[PDB]
Design a protein around this motif. Structure first.
Motif, short mmCIF file in Angstrom:
data_model
loop_
_atom_site.label_atom_id
_atom_site.label_comp_id
_atom_site.label_asym_id
_atom_site.label_seq_id
_atom_site.Cartn_x
_atom_site.Cartn_y
_atom_site.Cartn_z
N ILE A 125 -61.90 39.91 -12.02
CA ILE A 125 -60.73 40.78 -12.26
C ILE A 125 -60.19 41.43 -10.98
O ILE A 125 -59.03 41.22 -10.60
CB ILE A 125 -61.07 41.89 -13.28
CG1 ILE A 125 -61.69 41.29 -14.55
CG2 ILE A 125 -59.83 42.72 -13.61
CD1 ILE A 125 -62.08 42.34 -15.57
N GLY A 126 -61.04 42.23 -10.31
CA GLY A 126 -60.67 42.86 -9.06
C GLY A 126 -60.10 41.90 -8.04
O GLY A 126 -59.00 42.11 -7.51
N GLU A 127 -60.84 40.83 -7.77
CA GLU A 127 -60.37 39.78 -6.90
C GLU A 127 -58.95 39.33 -7.28
O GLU A 127 -58.05 39.29 -6.44
CB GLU A 127 -61.33 38.58 -6.92
CG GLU A 127 -62.68 38.85 -6.30
CD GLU A 127 -63.68 37.72 -6.57
OE1 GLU A 127 -64.52 37.85 -7.51
OE2 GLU A 127 -63.64 36.71 -5.84
N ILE A 128 -58.75 39.00 -8.56
CA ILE A 128 -57.44 38.52 -8.96
C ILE A 128 -56.41 39.64 -8.85
O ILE A 128 -55.34 39.43 -8.26
CB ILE A 128 -57.44 37.93 -10.38
CG1 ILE A 128 -58.32 36.68 -10.43
CG2 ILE A 128 -56.00 37.58 -10.81
CD1 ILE A 128 -58.32 35.96 -11.76
N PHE A 129 -56.73 40.82 -9.37
CA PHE A 129 -55.91 42.01 -9.16
C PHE A 129 -55.50 42.22 -7.70
O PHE A 129 -54.32 42.35 -7.38
CB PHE A 129 -56.64 43.24 -9.64
CG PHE A 129 -56.46 43.53 -11.08
CD1 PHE A 129 -56.00 42.55 -11.95
CD2 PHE A 129 -56.73 44.80 -11.57
CE1 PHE A 129 -55.82 42.84 -13.29
CE2 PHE A 129 -56.55 45.09 -12.89
CZ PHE A 129 -56.10 44.12 -13.76
N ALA A 130 -56.48 42.27 -6.81
CA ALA A 130 -56.23 42.39 -5.39
C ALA A 130 -55.16 41.40 -4.90
O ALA A 130 -54.25 41.77 -4.15
CB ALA A 130 -57.52 42.20 -4.63
N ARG A 131 -55.23 40.15 -5.33
CA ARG A 131 -54.24 39.16 -4.91
C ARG A 131 -52.80 39.52 -5.35
O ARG A 131 -51.84 39.23 -4.63
CB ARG A 131 -54.62 37.78 -5.43
CG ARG A 131 -55.91 37.25 -4.82
CD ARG A 131 -56.06 35.76 -5.04
NE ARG A 131 -57.33 35.26 -4.54
CZ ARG A 131 -57.66 33.97 -4.51
NH1 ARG A 131 -56.78 33.06 -4.93
NH2 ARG A 131 -58.84 33.59 -4.05
N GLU B 195 -51.76 42.68 -5.86
CA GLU B 195 -51.45 43.88 -5.09
C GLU B 195 -51.12 43.54 -3.64
O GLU B 195 -50.14 44.05 -3.09
CB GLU B 195 -52.62 44.85 -5.17
CG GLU B 195 -52.99 45.17 -6.61
CD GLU B 195 -53.90 46.38 -6.74
OE1 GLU B 195 -55.12 46.27 -6.44
OE2 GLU B 195 -53.40 47.44 -7.17
N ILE C 225 -49.36 47.08 -10.34
CA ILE C 225 -49.85 47.06 -11.71
C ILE C 225 -49.37 48.33 -12.40
O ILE C 225 -49.84 49.42 -12.10
CB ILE C 225 -51.37 46.91 -11.76
CG1 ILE C 225 -51.80 45.57 -11.16
CG2 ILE C 225 -51.89 47.03 -13.21
CD1 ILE C 225 -53.30 45.48 -10.79
N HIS D 144 -54.89 49.98 -4.76
CA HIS D 144 -56.26 49.62 -4.42
C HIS D 144 -57.12 49.27 -5.64
O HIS D 144 -58.33 49.21 -5.52
CB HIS D 144 -56.94 50.77 -3.65
CG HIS D 144 -56.33 51.07 -2.31
ND1 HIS D 144 -55.92 50.10 -1.43
CD2 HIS D 144 -56.05 52.26 -1.72
CE1 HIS D 144 -55.42 50.66 -0.34
NE2 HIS D 144 -55.48 51.97 -0.49
N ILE D 145 -56.51 49.04 -6.80
CA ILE D 145 -57.30 48.77 -8.02
C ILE D 145 -58.20 47.53 -7.90
O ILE D 145 -59.43 47.63 -8.01
CB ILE D 145 -56.38 48.61 -9.25
CG1 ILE D 145 -55.41 49.79 -9.36
CG2 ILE D 145 -57.21 48.45 -10.52
CD1 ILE D 145 -54.45 49.66 -10.52
N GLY D 146 -57.58 46.37 -7.68
CA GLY D 146 -58.32 45.13 -7.50
C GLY D 146 -59.43 45.23 -6.47
O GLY D 146 -60.58 44.91 -6.75
N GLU D 147 -59.06 45.68 -5.27
CA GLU D 147 -60.03 45.93 -4.22
C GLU D 147 -61.21 46.76 -4.74
O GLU D 147 -62.38 46.37 -4.58
CB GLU D 147 -59.37 46.64 -3.03
CG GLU D 147 -58.37 45.79 -2.27
CD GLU D 147 -57.56 46.60 -1.26
OE1 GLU D 147 -56.41 47.00 -1.57
OE2 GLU D 147 -58.09 46.84 -0.15
N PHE E 180 -62.06 47.49 -7.94
CA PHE E 180 -62.68 46.64 -8.96
C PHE E 180 -63.62 45.57 -8.38
O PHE E 180 -64.78 45.47 -8.77
CB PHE E 180 -61.61 45.95 -9.78
CG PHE E 180 -61.12 46.75 -10.93
CD1 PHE E 180 -61.34 48.12 -10.99
CD2 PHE E 180 -60.45 46.13 -11.98
CE1 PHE E 180 -60.90 48.85 -12.07
CE2 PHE E 180 -60.02 46.84 -13.05
CZ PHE E 180 -60.24 48.20 -13.11
N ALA E 181 -63.10 44.77 -7.47
CA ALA E 181 -63.89 43.76 -6.79
C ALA E 181 -65.23 44.33 -6.27
O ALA E 181 -66.28 43.71 -6.44
CB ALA E 181 -63.09 43.16 -5.67
#
Lengths: 140, 140
Positions: A22-28, A30, A36, B21-24, B26-27
């Motif tokens: 999730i975070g990884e994909i979210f980060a991409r 962002e 988001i 910074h959510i994804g980051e 989260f990751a």
């Protein structure tokens, strides 16, 4: 600015949710300038899945689709930015992981087209429908 | 296994949400073996913030706290894994960004203790309260 600011629906499908991407994909998202502006982890019911993919109820693949999209929790999210729809789909890559570019979500987190890590709206018009199905406008 | 599997509440505070910074963040949870078993982006009302930090209503810092925690959207999430509470707080770092270790969320995404990027439950008992305040058990 230059391009209209758009909103598009994201679903981190159950494969990727179970593999903790999730975070990884979210980060991409962002990183690429998409914000988001709504999100929630959800366990879809059959009726949830069917209703969302209603447009394809008479299709061959529909049943397997619904069973997968309800096999585990998903994260549904609303992304927002310039050219959001087309720029989302660019980060995801081709729907088929085989045909997808290097460094795309579909390339790095998915193996087959049956389980391709992520859903993205393919149009502004569908993004409006797809977003309104999972989110109240208050919720954004 | 060896340590009890625990559940703890995460809030990505509004500073970090506005700086995407959510994804980051989260990751970093996911990388460290914590699983996200619930999550939602939420705009807290004053009553939302007050009710959650009820234990400190008579405190000096309370008012500024409530105004910040309602200044922008937050993401509340439930993390799960071995030793979840203590291992969460280790990824976050000291509540004060000044005192926080390198490579912690508080060190990389926060400047002051007033706005420290993330909330973590400091105890299993509070994690139970804090989680039950934002999430129905169905929702997990």
């Amino acid at each position: 600015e230059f391009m209209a600011i758009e909103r598009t629906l994201s679903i981190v499908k159950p494969d990727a949710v179970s593999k903790n991407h999730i975070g990884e994909i979210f980060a991409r998202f962002e990183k690429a300038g998409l914000k988001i502006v709504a999100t929630k982890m959800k366990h879809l019911s059959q009726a949830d899945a069917e209703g969302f993919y209603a447009e394809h109820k008479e299709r061959g693949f529909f049943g397997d689709l619904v069973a997968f999209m309800t096999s585990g929790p998903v994260v549904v999210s609303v992304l927002e930015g310039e050219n959001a729809v087309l720029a989302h789909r660019e980060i995801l890559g081709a729907t088929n992981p085989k045909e997808a570019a290097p460094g795309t979500i579909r390339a790095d987190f998915a193996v087959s087209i049956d389980e391709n890590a992520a859903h993205g709206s393919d149009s502004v018009a569908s993004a409006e429908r797809e977003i309104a199905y999972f989110f109240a406008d208050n919720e954004i």
